[PDB]
Short mmCIF file of C-alpha atoms and ligand atoms in Angstrom, two decimals:
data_model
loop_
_atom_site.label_atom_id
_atom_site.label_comp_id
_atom_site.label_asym_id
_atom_site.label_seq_id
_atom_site.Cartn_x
_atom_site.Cartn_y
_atom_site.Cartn_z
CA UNK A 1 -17.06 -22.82 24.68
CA UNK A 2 -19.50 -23.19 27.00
CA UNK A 3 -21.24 -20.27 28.99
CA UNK A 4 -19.94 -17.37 26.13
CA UNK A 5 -20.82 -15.28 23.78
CA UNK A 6 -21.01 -14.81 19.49
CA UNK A 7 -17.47 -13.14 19.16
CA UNK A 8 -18.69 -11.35 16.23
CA UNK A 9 -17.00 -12.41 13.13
CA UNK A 10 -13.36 -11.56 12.40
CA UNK A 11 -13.04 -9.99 15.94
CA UNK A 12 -10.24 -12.62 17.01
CA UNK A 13 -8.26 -12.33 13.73
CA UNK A 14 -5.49 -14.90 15.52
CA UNK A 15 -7.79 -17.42 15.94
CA UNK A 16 -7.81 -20.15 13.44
CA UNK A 17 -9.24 -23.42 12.92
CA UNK A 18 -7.26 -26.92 12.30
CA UNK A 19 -9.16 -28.87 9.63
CA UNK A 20 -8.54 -32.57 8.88
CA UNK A 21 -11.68 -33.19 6.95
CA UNK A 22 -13.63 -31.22 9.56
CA UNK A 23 -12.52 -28.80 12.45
CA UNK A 24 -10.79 -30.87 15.16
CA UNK A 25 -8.76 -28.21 17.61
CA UNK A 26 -7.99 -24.36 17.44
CA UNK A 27 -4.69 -22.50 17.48
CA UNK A 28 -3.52 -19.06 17.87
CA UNK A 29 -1.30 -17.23 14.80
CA UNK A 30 1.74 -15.76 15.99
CA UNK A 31 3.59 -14.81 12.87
CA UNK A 32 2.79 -14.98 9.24
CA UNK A 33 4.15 -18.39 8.98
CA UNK A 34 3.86 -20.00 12.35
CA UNK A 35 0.36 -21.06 14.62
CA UNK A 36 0.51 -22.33 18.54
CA UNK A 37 -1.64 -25.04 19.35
CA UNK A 38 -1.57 -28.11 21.71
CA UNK A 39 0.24 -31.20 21.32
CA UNK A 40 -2.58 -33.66 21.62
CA UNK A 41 -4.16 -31.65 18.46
CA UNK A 42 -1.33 -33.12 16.26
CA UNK A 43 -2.27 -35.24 13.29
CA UNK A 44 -0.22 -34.89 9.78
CA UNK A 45 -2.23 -33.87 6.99
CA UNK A 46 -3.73 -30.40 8.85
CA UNK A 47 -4.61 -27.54 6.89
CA UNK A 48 -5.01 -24.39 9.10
CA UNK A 49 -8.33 -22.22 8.63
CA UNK A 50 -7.55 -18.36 9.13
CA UNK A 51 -9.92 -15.68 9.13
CA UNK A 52 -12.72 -17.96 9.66
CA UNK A 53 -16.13 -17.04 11.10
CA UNK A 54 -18.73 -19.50 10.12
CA UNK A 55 -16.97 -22.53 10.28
CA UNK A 56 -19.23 -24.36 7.52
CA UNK A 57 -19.29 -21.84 5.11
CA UNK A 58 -17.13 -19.63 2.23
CA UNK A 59 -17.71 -16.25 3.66
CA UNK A 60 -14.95 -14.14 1.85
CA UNK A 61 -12.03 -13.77 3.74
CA UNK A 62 -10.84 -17.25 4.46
CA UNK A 63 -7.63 -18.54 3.66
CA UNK A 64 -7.11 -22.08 3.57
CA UNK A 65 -3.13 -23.18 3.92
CA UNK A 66 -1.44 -26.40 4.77
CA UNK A 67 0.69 -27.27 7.09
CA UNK A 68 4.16 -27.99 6.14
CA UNK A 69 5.57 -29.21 9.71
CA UNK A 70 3.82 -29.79 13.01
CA UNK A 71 6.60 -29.44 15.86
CA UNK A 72 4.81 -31.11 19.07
CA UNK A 73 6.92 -30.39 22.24
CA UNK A 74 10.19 -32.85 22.69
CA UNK A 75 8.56 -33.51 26.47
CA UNK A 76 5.60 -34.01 25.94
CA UNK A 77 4.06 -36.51 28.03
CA UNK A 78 1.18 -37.32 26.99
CA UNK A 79 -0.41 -39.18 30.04
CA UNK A 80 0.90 -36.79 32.46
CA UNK A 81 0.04 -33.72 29.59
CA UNK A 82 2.95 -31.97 30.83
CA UNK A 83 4.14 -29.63 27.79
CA UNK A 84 0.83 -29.82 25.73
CA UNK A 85 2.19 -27.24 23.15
CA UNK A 86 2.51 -27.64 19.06
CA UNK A 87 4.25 -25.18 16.49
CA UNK A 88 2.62 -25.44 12.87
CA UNK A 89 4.61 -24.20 10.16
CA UNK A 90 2.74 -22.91 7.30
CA UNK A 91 3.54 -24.62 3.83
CA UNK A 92 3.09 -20.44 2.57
CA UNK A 93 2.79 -17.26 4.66
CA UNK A 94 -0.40 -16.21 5.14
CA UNK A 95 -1.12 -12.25 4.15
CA UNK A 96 -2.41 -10.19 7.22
CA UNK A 97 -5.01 -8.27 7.23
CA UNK A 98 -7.45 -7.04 9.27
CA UNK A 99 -9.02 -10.35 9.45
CA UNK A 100 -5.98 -11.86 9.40
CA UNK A 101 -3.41 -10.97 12.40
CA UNK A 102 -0.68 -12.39 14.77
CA UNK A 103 -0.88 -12.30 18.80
CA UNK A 104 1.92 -10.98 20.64
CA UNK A 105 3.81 -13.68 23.27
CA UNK A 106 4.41 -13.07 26.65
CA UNK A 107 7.38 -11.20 28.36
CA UNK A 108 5.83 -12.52 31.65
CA UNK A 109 3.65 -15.08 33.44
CA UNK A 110 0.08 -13.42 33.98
CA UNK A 111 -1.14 -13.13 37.41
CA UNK A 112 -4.33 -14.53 39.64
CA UNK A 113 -7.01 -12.99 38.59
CA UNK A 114 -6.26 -11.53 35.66
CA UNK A 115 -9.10 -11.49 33.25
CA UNK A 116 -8.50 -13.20 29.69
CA UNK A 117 -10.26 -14.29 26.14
CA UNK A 118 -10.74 -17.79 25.39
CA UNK A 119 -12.20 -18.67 22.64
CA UNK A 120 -13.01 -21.72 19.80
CA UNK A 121 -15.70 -23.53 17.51
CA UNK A 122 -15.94 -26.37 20.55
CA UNK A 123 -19.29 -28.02 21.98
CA UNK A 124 -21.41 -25.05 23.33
CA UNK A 125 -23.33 -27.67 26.21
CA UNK A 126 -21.77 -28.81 29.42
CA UNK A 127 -25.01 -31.71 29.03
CA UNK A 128 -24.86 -32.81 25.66
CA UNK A 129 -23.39 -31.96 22.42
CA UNK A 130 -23.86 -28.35 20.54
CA UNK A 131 -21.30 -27.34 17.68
CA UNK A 132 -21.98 -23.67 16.98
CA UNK A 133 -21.09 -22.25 13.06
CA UNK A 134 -19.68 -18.99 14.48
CA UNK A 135 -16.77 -18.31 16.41
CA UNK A 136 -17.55 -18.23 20.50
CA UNK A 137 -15.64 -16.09 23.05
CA UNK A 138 -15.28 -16.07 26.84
CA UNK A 139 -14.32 -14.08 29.21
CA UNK A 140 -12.26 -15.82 32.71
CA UNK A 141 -9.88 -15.24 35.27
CA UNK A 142 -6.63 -16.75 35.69
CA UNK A 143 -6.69 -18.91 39.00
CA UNK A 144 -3.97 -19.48 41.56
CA UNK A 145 -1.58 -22.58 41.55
CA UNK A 146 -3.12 -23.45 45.25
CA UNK A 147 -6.64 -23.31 43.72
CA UNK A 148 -6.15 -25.21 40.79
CA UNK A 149 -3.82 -27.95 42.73
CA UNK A 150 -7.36 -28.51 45.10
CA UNK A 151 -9.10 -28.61 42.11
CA UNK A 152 -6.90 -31.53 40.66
CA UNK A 153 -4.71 -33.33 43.32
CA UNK A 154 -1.42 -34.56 41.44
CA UNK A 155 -1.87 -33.30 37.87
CA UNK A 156 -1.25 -29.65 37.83
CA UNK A 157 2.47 -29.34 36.78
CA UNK A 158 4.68 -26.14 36.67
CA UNK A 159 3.42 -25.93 32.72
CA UNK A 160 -0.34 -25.83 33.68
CA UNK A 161 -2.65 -23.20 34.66
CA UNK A 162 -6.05 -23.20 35.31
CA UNK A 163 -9.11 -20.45 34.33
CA UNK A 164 -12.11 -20.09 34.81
CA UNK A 165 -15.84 -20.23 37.47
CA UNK A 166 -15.49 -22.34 40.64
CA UNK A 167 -19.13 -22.48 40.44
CA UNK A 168 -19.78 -23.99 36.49
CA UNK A 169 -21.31 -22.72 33.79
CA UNK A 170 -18.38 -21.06 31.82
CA UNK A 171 -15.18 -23.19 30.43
CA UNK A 172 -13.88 -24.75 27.22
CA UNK A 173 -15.09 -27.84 25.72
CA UNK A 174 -14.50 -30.38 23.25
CA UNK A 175 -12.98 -28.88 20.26
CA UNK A 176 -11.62 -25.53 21.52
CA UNK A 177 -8.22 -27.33 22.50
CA UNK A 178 -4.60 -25.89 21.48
CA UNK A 179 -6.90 -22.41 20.74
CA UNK A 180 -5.96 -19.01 22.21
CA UNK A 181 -6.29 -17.75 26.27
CA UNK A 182 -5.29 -13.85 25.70
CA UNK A 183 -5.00 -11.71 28.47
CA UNK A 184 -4.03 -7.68 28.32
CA UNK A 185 -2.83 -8.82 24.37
CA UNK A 186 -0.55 -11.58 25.21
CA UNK A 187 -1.12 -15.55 24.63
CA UNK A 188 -0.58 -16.73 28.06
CA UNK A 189 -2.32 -19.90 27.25
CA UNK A 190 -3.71 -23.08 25.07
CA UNK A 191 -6.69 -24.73 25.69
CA UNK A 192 -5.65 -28.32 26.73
CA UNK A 193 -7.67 -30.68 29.46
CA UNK A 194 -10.18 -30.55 31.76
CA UNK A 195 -12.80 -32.47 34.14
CA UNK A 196 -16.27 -32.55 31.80
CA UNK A 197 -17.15 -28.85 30.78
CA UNK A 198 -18.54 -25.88 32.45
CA UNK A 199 -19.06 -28.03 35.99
CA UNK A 200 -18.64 -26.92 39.79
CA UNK A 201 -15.16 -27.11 41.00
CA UNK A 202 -13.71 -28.15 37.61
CA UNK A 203 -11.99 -25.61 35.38
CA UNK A 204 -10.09 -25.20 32.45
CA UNK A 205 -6.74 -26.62 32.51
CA UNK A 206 -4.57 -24.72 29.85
CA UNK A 207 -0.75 -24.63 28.81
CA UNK A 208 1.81 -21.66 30.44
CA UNK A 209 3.02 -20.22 27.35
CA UNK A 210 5.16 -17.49 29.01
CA UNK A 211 7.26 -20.99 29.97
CA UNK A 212 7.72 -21.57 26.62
CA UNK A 213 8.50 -17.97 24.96
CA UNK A 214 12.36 -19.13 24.45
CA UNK A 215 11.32 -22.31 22.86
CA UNK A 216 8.70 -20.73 20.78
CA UNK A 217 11.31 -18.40 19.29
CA UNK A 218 14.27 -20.61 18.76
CA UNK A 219 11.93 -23.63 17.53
CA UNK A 220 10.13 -21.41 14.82
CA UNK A 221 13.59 -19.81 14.15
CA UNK A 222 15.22 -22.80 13.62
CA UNK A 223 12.96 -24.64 10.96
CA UNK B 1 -12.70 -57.98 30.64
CA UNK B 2 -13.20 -57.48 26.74
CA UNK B 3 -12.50 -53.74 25.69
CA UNK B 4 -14.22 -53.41 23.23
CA UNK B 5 -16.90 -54.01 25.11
CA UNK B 6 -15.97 -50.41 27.06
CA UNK B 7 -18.38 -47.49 26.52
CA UNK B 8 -16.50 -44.90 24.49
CA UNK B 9 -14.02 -42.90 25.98
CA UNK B 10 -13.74 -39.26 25.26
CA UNK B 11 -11.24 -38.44 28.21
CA UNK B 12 -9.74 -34.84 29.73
CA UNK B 13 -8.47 -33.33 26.58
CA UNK B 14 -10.43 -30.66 24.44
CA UNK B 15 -10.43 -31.93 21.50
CA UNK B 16 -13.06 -32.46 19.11
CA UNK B 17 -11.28 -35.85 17.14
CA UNK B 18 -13.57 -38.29 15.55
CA UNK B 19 -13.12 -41.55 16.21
CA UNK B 20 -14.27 -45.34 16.08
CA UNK B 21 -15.62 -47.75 18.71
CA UNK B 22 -17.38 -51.10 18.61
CA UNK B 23 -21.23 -50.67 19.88
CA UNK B 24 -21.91 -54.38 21.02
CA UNK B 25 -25.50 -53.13 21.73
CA UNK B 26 -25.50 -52.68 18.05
CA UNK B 27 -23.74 -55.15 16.54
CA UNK B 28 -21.33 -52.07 14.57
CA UNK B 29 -18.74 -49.55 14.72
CA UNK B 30 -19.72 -46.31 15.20
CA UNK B 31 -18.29 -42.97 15.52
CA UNK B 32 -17.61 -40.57 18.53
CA UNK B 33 -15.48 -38.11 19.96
CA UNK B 34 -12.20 -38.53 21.41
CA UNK B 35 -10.73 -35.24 23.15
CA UNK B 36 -7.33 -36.06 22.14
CA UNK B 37 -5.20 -37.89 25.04
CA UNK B 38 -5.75 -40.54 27.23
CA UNK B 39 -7.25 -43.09 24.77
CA UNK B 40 -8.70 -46.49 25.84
CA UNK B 41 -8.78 -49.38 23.56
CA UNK B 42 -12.25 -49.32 21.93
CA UNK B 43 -11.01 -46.18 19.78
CA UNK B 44 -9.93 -46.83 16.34
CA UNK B 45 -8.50 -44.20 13.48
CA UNK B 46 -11.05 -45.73 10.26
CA UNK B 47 -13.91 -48.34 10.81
CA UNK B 48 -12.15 -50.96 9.16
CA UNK B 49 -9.61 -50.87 11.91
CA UNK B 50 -12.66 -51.45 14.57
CA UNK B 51 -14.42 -54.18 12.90
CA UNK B 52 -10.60 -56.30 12.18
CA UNK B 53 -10.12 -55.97 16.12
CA UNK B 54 -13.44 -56.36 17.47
CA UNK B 55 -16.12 -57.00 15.11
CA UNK B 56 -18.53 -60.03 16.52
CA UNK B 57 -17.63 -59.09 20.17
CA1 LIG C 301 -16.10 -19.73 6.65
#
């Protein structure tokens, strides 16, 4: 995240970290069992970090759990990145606590201009490379379909959204992907592709979950 | 035009993934990051993958 803030640690208790030797993408905890995350984050072998602050360090209320199946979208295209979504099963079901905790899905799209959380362990520089320990948060607006088409002629599909500052300095970076974009409690998006990081006239791109609440439901329900 | 003579590609996604390329400034395979989609050729899963494909470009 570049442009944001020190959350504070264990103030996004949905966010967790996906760990294949190292922390490679985010995702969002929707039930005990179950994390949303992007489909260009799959790999086999995650484990899934919850209640994680520090990234690189045993702080007390981590728990560290496999995954046991990693569901990437059936269309998911991934030169177009049309349906960038991934459902992680967890090999046991986490136990929520405050630290620990689920984020409500949609029962609607979200709106221009609606204000929203993003947040991830990503590169903190939009020139050059920072990895922060702690957990970083940002605050953006949802932007219209015309706005985000102008930003990116022929690659925003009905599945995409995009969020953020017009004029740089604020966005998601390398190693935030398939985390959470919350907005008035809901996850209305995943962090998933973008133009460089934190530059004029290029923001976020990030997944339309409130397409995908049916699939979400059945999928999770069904394995 | 020899890929793996291509400066590493990190691409659109967000990703933090390490990766491989051949450096043919230095003669080695070294490590970067791929964002996750939209790979080019000089990016290999392990080291021994880059140096069987393009070691001694
Ligand atoms: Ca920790």
């Amino acid at each position: 995240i570049v442009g944001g803030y020190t959350c504070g640690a264990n103030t996004v208790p949905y966010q967790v970290s996906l760990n294949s030797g190292y922390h490679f993408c985010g995702g969002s905890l929707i039930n005990s069992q179950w994390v949303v995350s992007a489909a260009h984050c799959y790999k086999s072998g995650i484990q899934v970090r919850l209640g994680e602050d520090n990234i690189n360090v045993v702080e007390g209320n981590e728990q560290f759990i496999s995954a046991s199946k990693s569901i990437v979208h059936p269309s998911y295209n991934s030169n177009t990145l049309n349906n960038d979504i991934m459902l992680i099963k967890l090999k046991s079901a986490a136990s929520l606590n405050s630290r620990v905790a689920s984020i409500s899905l949609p029962t609607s799209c979200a709106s221009a201009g609606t204000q929203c959380l993003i947040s991830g362990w990503g590169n903190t520089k939009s020139s050059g490379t920072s990895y922060p320990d702690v957990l970083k948060c940002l605050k953006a607006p949802i932007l219209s379909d015309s706005s985000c088409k102008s930003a990116y002629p022929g690659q925003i599909t009905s599945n995409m959204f995009c969020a953020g500052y017009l004029e740089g300095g604020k966005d998601s970076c390398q190693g935030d992907s398939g985390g959470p974009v919350v907005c008035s409690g809901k996850l209305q998006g995943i962090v998933s592709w973008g133009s460089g990081c934190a530059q004029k006239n290029k923001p976020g791109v990030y997944t339309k979950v409130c397409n995908y609440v049916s699939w979400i439901k059945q999928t999770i329900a069904s394995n | 035009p020899d890929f793996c003579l291509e400066p590493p590609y990190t691409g659109p996604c967000x990703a933090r993934i390490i990766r491989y390329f051949y450096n043919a400034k230095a003669g080695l395979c070294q490590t970067f990051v791929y964002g996750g989609c939209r790979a080019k050729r000089n990016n290999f899963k392990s080291a021994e993958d880059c140096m069987r494909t393009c070691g001694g470009a």
